């Protein structure tokens, strides 16, 4: 596990990436970590926004499965040949492993400008894999061939950083990456890491909303999404609650909002808290993000002002707990026990101040027995 500390490069704005050696002899690739999908796919051709691609003809241990797969996302898709090859994770495993891999020969809106990765690692469940749940996921391959528990945890250390590293621990929990207690919330469904949101608070204040709005379709934890995404109706409630507590295409991400450095904008904004049901259903815990996490700096130090992006965008189908929230917490994907754990990330600090908080237990007498429709 200690060999896996700081095995990630990147930042929330662009994503976090793992380094991988693929095939014989090895081809080094920079792989995005996506707990929101279930395929291992890499560039298979030259493309305008990647330095490098995996050449299956240059690998003696590559073996084509003789079919291709298409994966559609919300915005952006790709189509790739499916093969098997031997992979090594240098920062974590001395031994190499045989996984399925798709080699992208057609994509649209997938490799974007300024991106550092040239592949993605789907860490979600078998049920989401394409073309079917029968295509053994990368982590399922890893569990079996590496003898590790069915658990991985993730820490991003990008808070404060200009939008324009971390650790992925495969097979458990690294105690040097947190302090305090881990709070566990059950996984409601095994496809996405779907969990149950009870309440949203904006500065100690509950939104009027019914608890089901939060799980409208589903509430998921997804490292491959940048922002905290909310169902259109919930998003509108949060904007109006934040706005009437602070002082515009800002909210909708058409404009940035700028301040001179003396103006210290981080105090004018409220804290946002998401309540989650504990394994004991009679209690809940609270994950809190400060302004520093959702009022995001664009440029970084250099000028005598800063421009800021709003780290919360609307969504149609899901409530997506993305990097905007994941930057605050060490997140434990405890597949073996069907639960997701949260602890505060010691690295989530700016100017010595924690930019996230965790606390509980709180009673759930108030809320319905099941917020999941």
């Amino acid at each position, epitope marked *: 596990f200690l060999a896996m500390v700081d095995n990630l490069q990147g930042d929330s704005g662009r994503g976090y990436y793992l380094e991988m050696l693929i095939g014989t002899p090895p081809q080094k690739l920079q792989i995005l970590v996506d707990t929101g999908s279930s395929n291992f796919a890499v560039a298979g051709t030259p493309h305008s926004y990647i330095d490098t691609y995996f050449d299956t003809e240059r690998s003696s241990t590559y073996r084509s*499965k003789g079919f291709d797969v298409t994966v559609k996302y919300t915005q952006g898709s790709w189509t790739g040949f499916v093969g098997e090859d031997l992979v090594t994770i240098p920062k974590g495993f001395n031994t190499s492993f*045989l996984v399925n891999i798709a080699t992208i020969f057609e994509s649209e809106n997938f490799f974007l400008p300024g991106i550092k990765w040239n592949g993605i690692l789907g860490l979600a469940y*078998a049920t989401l894999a394409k073309p079917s749940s029968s295509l053994e996921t990368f982590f399922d391959s890893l569990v*079996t061939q590496a003898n590790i528990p069915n658990v991985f945890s993730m820490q991003m250390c990008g808070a404060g950083l200009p939008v324009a590293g971390g650790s992925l621990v495969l097979g458990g929990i690294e105690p040097s990456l947190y302090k305090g207690d881990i709070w566990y919330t059950p996984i409601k469904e095994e496809w996405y890491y779907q969990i149950e949101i009870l309440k949203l608070e904006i500065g100690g204040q509950s939104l009027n909303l019914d608890c089901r709005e939060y799980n409208a379709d589903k509430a998921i934890v997804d490292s491959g999404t940048t922002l905290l995404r909310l169902p259109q109706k919930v998003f509108d409630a949060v904007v109006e609650a934040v706005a009437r507590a602070s002082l515009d295409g800002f909210w909708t991400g058409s404009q940035l909002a700028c301040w001179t450095n003396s103006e210290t904008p981080w105090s004018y904004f409220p804290k946002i808290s998401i309540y989650l049901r504990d394994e004991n259903s009679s209690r809940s815990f609270r994950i809190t993000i400060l302004p520093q996490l959702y009022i995001q700096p664009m440029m970084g130090a250099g000028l005598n002002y800063e421009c800021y992006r709003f780290g919360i965008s609307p969504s149609t189908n899901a409530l997506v707990i993305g990097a905007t929230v994941m930057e605050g917490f060490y997140v434990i994907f405890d597949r073996a026990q069907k639960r997701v754990g949260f602890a505060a990330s010691p690295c989530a600090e700016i100017a010595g101040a924690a930019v996230s908080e965790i606390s509980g237990p709180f009673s759930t007498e108030d809320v319905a027995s099941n917020c999941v429709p």
Partner: nanobody
């Protein structure tokens, strides 16, 4: 995805055994297949993996040389051939694919 292992039993040390995994409910011939064992009082141990076309085979050092993984794609069957068995091969052996496994077959080497 359904899987069924057989072939286990009580064998003497230095003996030999063939395990079988009959697979149904998915296209076996497209699937990476893996054998894992679970010895008593020990952690689960990976044994051997085989790529779908059966030309790539990998083995645990502890079985390198004695065990042979193989598959018959036409008959949706996976094999593990085990020679020079020793008391520490006593384990339940599980055939496994896409996070699914069968009920196992116990092997006892006294």
């Amino acid at each position: 995805v359904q899987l069924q292992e057989s072939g286990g039993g009580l064998v003497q040390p230095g003996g030999s055994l063939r395990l079988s995994c009959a697979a149904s409910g998915f296209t076996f011939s497209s699937a990476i297949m893996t054998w894992v064992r679970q010895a008593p009082g020990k952690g689960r141990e990976w044994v051997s993996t085989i790529g779908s076309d059966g030309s790539i085979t990998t083995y645990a050092d502890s079985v390198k040389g004695r065990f042979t993984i193989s598959r018959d794609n036409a008959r949706n069957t996976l094999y593990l051939q085990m020679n020079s068995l020793k008391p520490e091969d006593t384990a339940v052996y599980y055939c496994t694919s896409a996070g699914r496994r069968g009920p196992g077959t116990q092997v006892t080497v006294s």
